[PDB]
Design a protein around this ligand. Structure first.
Ligand SMILES: Cc1cc2nc3c(=O)[nH]c(=O)nc-3n(C[C@H](O)[C@H](O)[C@H](O)COP(=O)(O)OP(=O)(O)OC[C@H]3O[C@@H](n4cnc5c(N)ncnc54)[C@H](O)[C@@H]3O)c2cc1C
Ligand SMILES: Cc1cc2nc3c(=O)[nH]c(=O)nc-3n(C[C@H](O)[C@H](O)[C@H](O)COP(=O)(O)OP(=O)(O)OC[C@H]3O[C@@H](n4cnc5c(N)ncnc54)[C@H](O)[C@@H]3O)c2cc1C
Ligand SMILES: Cc1cc2nc3c(=O)[nH]c(=O)nc-3n(C[C@H](O)[C@H](O)[C@H](O)COP(=O)(O)OP(=O)(O)OC[C@H]3O[C@@H](n4cnc5c(N)ncnc54)[C@H](O)[C@@H]3O)c2cc1C
Ligand SMILES: Cc1cc2nc3c(=O)[nH]c(=O)nc-3n(C[C@H](O)[C@H](O)[C@H](O)COP(=O)(O)OP(=O)(O)OC[C@H]3O[C@@H](n4cnc5c(N)ncnc54)[C@H](O)[C@@H]3O)c2cc1C
Ligand SMILES: CN1c2c(nc(N)[nH]c2=O)NC[C@@H]1CNc1ccc(C(=O)N[C@@H](CCC(=O)O)C(=O)O)cc1
Ligand SMILES: CN1c2c(nc(N)[nH]c2=O)NC[C@@H]1CNc1ccc(C(=O)N[C@@H](CCC(=O)O)C(=O)O)cc1
Ligand SMILES: CN1c2c(nc(N)[nH]c2=O)NC[C@@H]1CNc1ccc(C(=O)N[C@@H](CCC(=O)O)C(=O)O)cc1
Ligand SMILES: OC[C@@H](O)[C@@H](O)CO
Lengths: 285, 285, 278, 266
């Protein structure tokens, strides 16, 4: 019985991973007092897992940069964790960006997630600018399914290489649900001579309607079986959570077996799903 | 990438099962007003899935038979579903059992789950007795991992055959977590010439401490990876639920692929996990 | 990589059976002073594994010595090829009156009238003995047909045997198919595999040929060229036996009977792999 | 159809010296494609490695490859050493960086400049402990192959899938040379566990459990270890592996028997 045997082997291998998996968590600036409370609850909960770092988004063109910086300082003060602000360049001048970068460095914030931003400079230009300011750890975005604006898959891949050559020392992927796409992309990164680990960004899905809208805008494929899995659950938050957890747990189990030892979670500021997924990877308090 | 491909295929096959899976749900008589409320909530919720039948346990030697009968009538009146009482013989005389059986039949209750009972007559004796009373549908217990009191695996298997030959038309298994054990047992049932479907009894685990105590008393193996999965979760009900759901969903996905189209859920009177597992099998309102 | 994953699952399942496997060990009466010492050493070494019982081929003395030395259930083998239906009742009653409640009832190899079924019936007429009888997955050489020999096993069980122990075999599929045919025939006792760990292939093959036990081509090839290499034979033979019991365990076998040939090393190691440890 | 090679180390005692030559005679009868001898900067030096290589060549006629490292050696020293080896009929070198400047790829390049050596290099299915990433380590192996290595020999492993997945990644990366599994037959688990822990080589739970309780039982360890190794090579062979490199630790019995099971016989 192949399928049963395969499952037992996959599960046992996952069990033996305990203590070898590095994780990171991504948060966004709360917009309500209710979300603020939720976030700090989640930060406390997830901090107990000793993530390698956490990060905080910055909405391009939002003009709310101060919120990002304030959350980052709060995290460092409260937890002692490495906290990395996201920084976009599409909405700031190089001079403004150098000032922002210098202030981060002087405030002990020395890992930046460097992005172009949701709509002059491209992300690689930001990477170069940041390294000129100081010796930052820099993480950049990777797209196993190709960024929607890329002229070609080759162009997008060479762009990642450009960002790495400019000084990026981590790549974090856009979320995906087609696991084969990530694995094929990881191999293509080797073919392009990219020597940094390609860290999968995991989106645990509880609100499928919303995840689908974003996937559709970002060129991320939702397999037919996954669409079928969430069909009929618009008003059943409980079942959606269980189904979503199952999907994410399956994904990390397979990725772990294929040698992935780094995961970045898009928490949407909630701890429950990411914490449980980490538990299955042997990442525990 | 074998593991990824295998998952996609398994998931898609599960998606195509929609509308082909029969399910049944097992409940027990509530002992508190709180549990009473929970049960009827669960009955309403699960009834919407159109189970082939539901059943209600009867604790052997408990002397609380009237509770079982009362719950069964309540279910039939409320839902129109086929509801099957469990009946044990270890604690009643044949005459008492015939009276009980006749009263059930005359009350429109014509499917009985016939058991010996947790500690004279063996279950096969009860099956014979029931068929003498009337043409009941009769379900009996099967043990993929061998009943703890059996002289041998062969003896236990021939006992199942005895119960089927006496008139049992369904076999429902003790819960298991070693899926290969069920599949091997299903094949052994064919070797013994048993022509009834062997319906897996599924226990969705949220309280592992308690499931383990019962498994240990019933000769049910808990794989090491499963013990590791629940390790450290004694005080984390949320994570236990997500982990447990993941395990049960994986099990039914594999069983479905191997051709199982009937599942019996040990609900412990709660709807959430069983309902979600059914959802993944395409059993939906 | 199905083969790799399958092996990992099989090995892990074996690791998890630890503490749930019943084992028994078979010994023979020593013919020399050297073998005498070897035997009691093996007994001391193997007793630490807490076997469900041990047996001695046919003897009465060894059985007694084992019982006193270790307190293990020691079952003498008894054949009806030697004595008369009356002497058997005398030798049997003599056992029960000493603490010997388990007997391996056999017809016996024939030297250069009644069958084992008759011996089981006889032994039981004396007392409520534990009776173990021989089963033959590949059919006893004298039997007229597979079904006839199978029905014979049924007779022996119906007569009072509560255990069947198999002739040794090397084709696991043969054992498994036979086990299935037994249940189909309504035989409700376990069919306990008799395992022969092979270190001397020339000798094992001689015996296999006389007993209708098949030696698979892969096994013949595995031992080819090792007539003068005792060390490699031991490693090859241990590997074969370990693989066999690993497969058998996954198929739900929880009882094993070891033909030790009075040596502890190989059986002790195989038991170790089954989680049967001091 | 199966090729084998055996790895030895320079004996540091009279007792081990006797054991090694016994093992060489035993294993040479299997006609390995080559044998190799390790180097320890503080456990024998280059002269001891070379002495054993010469002895093997003289005694058996087999191709014998020294493991040559580049730590604490200058490029001019390495060129002089390589020239000497080539002139002495040593035509296969296992080119390594070394257990603590140059990386192994630099040594491969240097050696190919000297002469058309057969060169074998180290590969790590579970990633070299110092690599900045699995991607970087794979790109390094490709650098070594592109510089002229015609063979990769893996660190030992006990998770067979790890080797299989690694081989697939090598092929995907366009690394076209054989990725030969290094096999460590285990008769002393305490010693093996130490070696594995230091190199990030996973020991499956079932394997640790298999050796539990055998600290003082050498005989059972041998039988259990032989079973593990025979099983591994059987699976690997089924998956198309036609070359095996045995970490003998100067003992012949286990490797010889494993080879027997692969059909490699005198
Ligand atoms: C992990 C992660 C975190 C993120 N965090 C944020 C956040 O905090 N705030 C936010 O607004 N967005 C965020 N994003 C989204 C991101 O900003 C968008 O996906 C944006 O469209 C691209 O950003 P980038 O850094 O990848 O840009 P780039 O790397 O510069 O690539 C963007 C597009 O430009 C193309 N391109 C690159 N160079 C050239 C060139 N020289 N000429 C022509 N085309 C070129 C690329 O191929 C690609 O199609 C995040 C995305 C990820 C994966
Ligand atoms: C789906 C399911 C629902 C259950 N519901 C209940 C419930 O509502 N109330 C309750 O108290 N328990 C219940 N049980 C538990 C059950 O009662 C116990 O497992 C009990 O120990 C065995 O019951 P049985 O009907 O299987 O008995 P049996 O089938 O009679 O078998 C019991 C044991 O007797 C052995 N045996 C059978 N015939 C003979 C013979 N002629 N001579 C010697 N040994 C023999 C069998 O091999 C076995 O070991 C349930 C179990 C399952 C799987
Ligand atoms: C675990 C084990 C332990 C053993 N220990 C010993 C020992 O200690 N001493 C020793 O000398 N030998 C021993 N033997 C070997 C055994 O004695 C021989 O195999 C002998 O040939 C058959 O013995 P049996 O008990 O199987 O008899 P049987 O069951 O009677 O079978 C012998 C043949 O007779 C046939 N047969 C049986 N009844 C009838 C009938 N009524 N009509 C027609 N045909 C019939 C059967 O099919 C079979 O072919 C042992 C064998 C095993 C597997
Ligand atoms: C089959 C085999 C036989 C061995 N025999 C011996 C022996 O006899 N004696 C001994 O002392 N050791 C021996 N070793 C071990 C070896 O020496 C160590 O593992 C050592 O740490 C690395 O050797 P290497 O040849 O693999 O080096 P490399 O291939 O150079 O790799 C070493 C590390 O450097 C990294 N790296 C490579 N290029 C760069 C770069 N440009 N910038 C940054 N990092 C880089 C690699 O990714 C890796 O992490 C052996 C190993 C194997 C697998
Ligand atoms: C920075 N993110 C991002 C990106 N890609 C692009 N182009 N832009 C981005 O901002 N990929 C990674 C990450 C994805 N972030 C997100 C943010 C919200 C939801 C979303 O579905 N939110 C729902 C429900 C949230 C919940 O379940 O709590 C919503 O209601 O908005 C999904 C992914
Ligand atoms: C009739 N049942 C049963 C059996 N087998 C035997 N021998 N006896 C039985 O009564 N197998 C099938 C079914 C199993 N029923 C059960 C009943 C309670 C729990 C248990 O774990 N209850 C926990 C928590 C319940 C919850 O999560 O809500 C408890 O606290 O008692 C598990 C299986
Ligand atoms: C009671 N036995 C038995 C039988 N089958 C028959 N027909 N007769 C029997 O006596 N099957 C089970 C068991 C088999 N016993 C044996 C006895 C010796 C050897 C054997 O080959 N021994 C070699 C060397 C022993 C050693 O390795 O130390 C020998 O010739 O002594 C194999 C199985
Ligand atoms: O002795 C085994 C050793 O050479 C390998 O682990 C590579 O370092």
């Amino acid at each position: 019985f192949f399928h049963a045997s395969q499952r037992d082997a996959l599960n046992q291998s996952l069990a033996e991973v305990q203590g070898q998996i590095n994780v990171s968590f991504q948060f966004f600036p709360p917009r309500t007092s209710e979300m603020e409370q939720t976030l700090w609850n989640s930060i406390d909960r997830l901090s107990s897992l000793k993530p390698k770092f956490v990060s905080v988004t910055y909405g391009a063109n939002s003009g709310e940069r101060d919120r990002t910086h304030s959350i980052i300082k709060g995290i460092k003060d409260r937890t002692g964790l490495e906290a990395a602000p996201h920084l976009t360049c599409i909405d700031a001048t190089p001079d403004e960006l150098r000032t922002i970068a210098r202030d981060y460095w002087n405030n002990g914030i020395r890992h930046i997630v460097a992005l172009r931003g949701d709509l002059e400079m491209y992300a690689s230009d930001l990477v170069t600018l940041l390294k000129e300011v100081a010796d930052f750890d820099i993480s950049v975005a990777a797209y196993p399914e190709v960024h929607p604006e890329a002229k070609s898959a080759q162009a997008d891949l060479l762009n990642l290489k450009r960002k790495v050559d400019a000084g990026a020392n981590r790549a974090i992927t856009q979320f995906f649900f087609d696991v084969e796409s990530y694995l094929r992309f990881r191999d293509r990164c080797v073919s392009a001579g990219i020597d940094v680990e390609i860290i999968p960004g995991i989106l645990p899905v509880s609100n499928f309607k919303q995840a689908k809208k974003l996937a559709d805008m970002t060129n991320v494929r939702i397999p037919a079986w996954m669409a079928q899995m969430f069909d009929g659950l618009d008003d059943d938050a409980e079942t959606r959570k269980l189904v979503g957890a199952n999907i994410a747990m399956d994904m990390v189990k397979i990725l772990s077996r294929e040698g992935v030892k780094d995961f970045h979670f898009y928490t949407l500021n909630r701890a429950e799903m990411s914490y449980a997924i980490c538990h299955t990877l042997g990442v525990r308090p």
